[PDB]
Amino acid sequence: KSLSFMRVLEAVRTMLQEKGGLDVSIVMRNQVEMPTTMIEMIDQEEEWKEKYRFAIHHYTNEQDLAGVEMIDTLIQMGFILPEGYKLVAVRHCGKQNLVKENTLIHAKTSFEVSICREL
Amino acid sequence: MKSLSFMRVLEAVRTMLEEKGGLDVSIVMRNQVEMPTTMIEMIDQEEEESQTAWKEKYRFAIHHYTNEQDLAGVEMIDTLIQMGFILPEGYKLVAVRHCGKQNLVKENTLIHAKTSFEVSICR
Amino acid sequence: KSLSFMRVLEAVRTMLQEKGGLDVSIVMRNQVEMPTTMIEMIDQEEEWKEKYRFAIHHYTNEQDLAGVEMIDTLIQMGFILPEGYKLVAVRHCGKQNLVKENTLIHAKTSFEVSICREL
Amino acid sequence: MKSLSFMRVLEAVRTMLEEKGGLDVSIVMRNQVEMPTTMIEMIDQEEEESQTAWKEKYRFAIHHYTNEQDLAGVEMIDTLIQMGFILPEGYKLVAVRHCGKQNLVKENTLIHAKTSFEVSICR
Amino acid sequence: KSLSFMRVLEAVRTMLQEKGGLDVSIVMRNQVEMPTTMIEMIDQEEEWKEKYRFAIHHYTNEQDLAGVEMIDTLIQMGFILPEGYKLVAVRHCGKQNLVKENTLIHAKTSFEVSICREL
Amino acid sequence: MKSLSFMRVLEAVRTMLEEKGGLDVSIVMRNQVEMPTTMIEMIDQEEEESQTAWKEKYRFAIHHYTNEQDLAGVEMIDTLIQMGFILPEGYKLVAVRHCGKQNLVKENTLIHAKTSFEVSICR
């Protein structure tokens, strides 16, 4: 079977939290007022091989190159998946933004991951 | 050897989730949701290349609205759909794929989960 | 020459009416309040061979699998065209929807038809 | 051997429908219509591959607004356009095709018919 | 190096003004009330060879085939560029419109130009 | 051999325009501008095919708002960016291209100039 996107979201959140000590939410929200990091799942395509695309949203009061890049690097190093599923590649793909929304610096980083399952 | 209508496919999936899953799912997409619910949204349908037969792809999405995060419920639905559903004699479900938009977003006071599928059916 | 889309609309309506006893309108309308069936022409492409794409909109107070599928089946069986033009194929193509609009169940079914003319 | 301007093509078509059809047609698209009228809407223009010459595709649409269904009138226009229209010396109308959006829709109190063409012109 | 789109805009304006005696603005404006001719740059792609796409907007109180076509012809004949850059081709490409906006006849003509530089 | 984050690329460009150009440029895109300013808007990032290495394309746009036409300033920025910018050890700037939307438009009381680039970076 193919892993639910939500399972993938959870694995990234757990990695960010356990490996980076970061507090990341897996639910996308439109209106944001205080600093926060959310993961936004975008789409999925089965190519035993699959691609998931999601973006990391990092809101901060000031430009946070260090934090954004910690996250970027953490994700690129990988994350554990449930038995039978293996992360095979991580790459940047799609929209990368840095914009001022409300009073906050909003950084959006888009990833594509390739995941293999047992056949 | 007539091409199956989308609604027949809607029904096949709804019936399976009810019978095999005990879940109540609507096959009518609603644009204004203000309470938890599970809906199937049909999207499109296309012929697929078939050497030896007639193959067709149907795309639809499952919309799962809940008061809060519900990974257990989302995965239940997701896994049942991938396990397949019975079709009328002459039609063979060839493959069930995640394909297209996958979302987890807050809407007012609901968590909105959206899972997109593409199924291949042969005749 | 190539048949006007409207001529094709008329031939489908006549088929639905004469072969299915259904009352179908060939004019697309946005706001719909009472049960009805309309044909919506979408586009046309000349490939002596041509493709027309149109959708059938079936509004009912309750889910109407029987009615929707009668129509679906009627259309798939074909319809007569003016002399010199022959329907060669009918297939599902594009958006297929089932949505609740106003108080009505709105079913949209999209078709592509291939039509040949004398050369 | 200069590429023909869209307006020249607009004029060629308008002139034909008037001269051969006795129809009054505008070459100016209007976004706010509240009475019956026939308009040509120019859309786009592209080079086409030509081995031996210079070929170009022009796309435009005929907008036919009437108080009610008018298949006779729509077909009159449609048939004249497919029969061709004369162009300046050096340019040969190679083909007239239905291509793109074809619509029949109600707008307020008018029936709006839209027919899309692609013409190939060679030089 | 590659020529800035603005440099290309300026060269077309100078050509229209010096070769055609026309008064053309290189700044696109949304709301237009009096007759005018503006150039609207759209996009650019490097293929030593490059393509620029821009549209000419010609607003007049009455249909102006003569004026529109003078411009069309002027542009097709070419325009001079700064040393090291040569216009190699001009062709129609993209949206060509004739619409009534406000009280004015708005003509939009889209061009693609190929420009070569020294290597 | 880790893929470079967009922000690192933003910084590389900003730093160059400041150090080599004496220009003050923001790397934060603002949706509501009411005074002259120069901003870099990051757009997207994609892998590029590499035979022998790892190549990646980054796209961004320079937004130059001024009280009036400023060809001198637009060209200054444009030329510096094409001259390149230094990157961290291991990454080689392979090419700087104009690519995508290029605009010169009036917005309220400002002239808004938009220049779109694609850069290829290798590792």
Side-chain angles (χ1 to χ4, degrees), chain D residues 87-91 93-100 102-107 109-120:
Chain D
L87 295 170
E89 308 289 338
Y91 307 87
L93 182 70
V94 173
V96 180
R97 293 181 217 81
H98 294 299
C99 178
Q102 322 287 326
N103 298 343
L104 188 57
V105 62
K106 166 176 182 304
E107 286 178 17
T109 44
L110 297 166
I111 302 303
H112 176 192
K114 179 183 174 177
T115 301
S116 294
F117 292 97
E118 173 179 89
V119 298
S120 288

Side-chain angles (χ1 to χ4, degrees), chain B residues 15-17 19 21-29 33 36-48 50-54 56-91 93-96:
Chain B
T15 291
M16 179 275 302
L17 292 164
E19 286 307 320
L23 304 173
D24 189 5
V25 177
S26 185
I27 66 169
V28 173
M29 189 48 192
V33 177
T37 179
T38 308
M39 288 171 319
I40 318 175
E41 184 201 11
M42 185 68 39
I43 300 157
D44 66 13
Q45 186 181 341
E46 297 291 345
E47 298 204 320
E48 184 185 330
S50 192
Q51 6 131 64
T52 55
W54 295 265
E56 211 153 351
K57 291 182 177 196
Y58 304 67
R59 295 177 206 101
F60 59 83
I62 302 298
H63 294 271
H64 193 51
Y65 296 82
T66 46
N67 287 151
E68 69 188 29
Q69 281 174 234
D70 178 17
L71 175 91
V74 161
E75 274 184 333
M76 174 158 156
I77 292 169
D78 193 85
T79 299
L80 289 172
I81 295 169
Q82 291 192 77
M83 271 180 44
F85 39 93
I86 54 80
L87 295 170
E89 308 289 338
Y91 307 87
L93 182 70
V94 173
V96 180

Side-chain angles (χ1 to χ4, degrees), chain E residues 12-17 20-23 70-71 74:
Chain E
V12 173
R13 161 193 236 267
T14 298
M15 183 279 289
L16 290 176
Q17 302 200 333
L22 305 179
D23 206 322
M70 190 187 188
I71 292 165
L74 286 178

Side-chain angles (χ1 to χ4, degrees), chain C residues 24-28 32-44 46 48 50-61 63-82 84-94:
Chain C
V24 188
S25 182
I26 63 163
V27 173
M28 187 57 183
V32 186
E33 280 181 318
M34 295 290 321
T36 195
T37 318
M38 321 170 281
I39 308 173
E40 177 205 6
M41 185 60 60
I42 300 168
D43 61 21
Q44 188 180 340
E46 290 182 39
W48 60 294
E50 300 187 56
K51 289 179 186 176
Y52 301 65
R53 292 167 208 86
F54 63 81
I56 307 289
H57 300 266
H58 190 67
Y59 288 83
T60 51
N61 285 104
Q63 313 195 204
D64 187 13
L65 190 133
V68 166
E69 213 182 4
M70 190 187 188
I71 292 165
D72 196 271
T73 301
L74 286 178
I75 290 176
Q76 286 196 254
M77 296 170 59
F79 40 93
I80 300 312
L81 293 171
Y85 298 93
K86 285 300 180 73
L87 175 70
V88 162
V90 179
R91 62 179 71 74
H92 294 289
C93 178

Side-chain angles (χ1 to χ4, degrees), chain F residues 8 47 63 70 115:
Chain F
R8 222 67 127 71
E47 298 204 320
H63 294 271
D70 178 17
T115 301

Side-chain angles (χ1 to χ4, degrees), chain F residues 40-48 50-54 56-91 93-98:
Chain F
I40 318 175
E41 184 201 11
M42 185 68 39
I43 300 157
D44 66 13
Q45 186 181 341
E46 297 291 345
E47 298 204 320
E48 184 185 330
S50 192
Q51 6 131 64
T52 55
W54 295 265
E56 211 153 351
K57 291 182 177 196
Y58 304 67
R59 295 177 206 101
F60 59 83
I62 302 298
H63 294 271
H64 193 51
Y65 296 82
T66 46
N67 287 151
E68 69 188 29
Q69 281 174 234
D70 178 17
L71 175 91
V74 161
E75 274 184 333
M76 174 158 156
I77 292 169
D78 193 85
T79 299
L80 289 172
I81 295 169
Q82 291 192 77
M83 271 180 44
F85 39 93
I86 54 80
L87 295 170
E89 308 289 338
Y91 307 87
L93 182 70
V94 173
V96 180
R97 293 181 217 81
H98 294 299

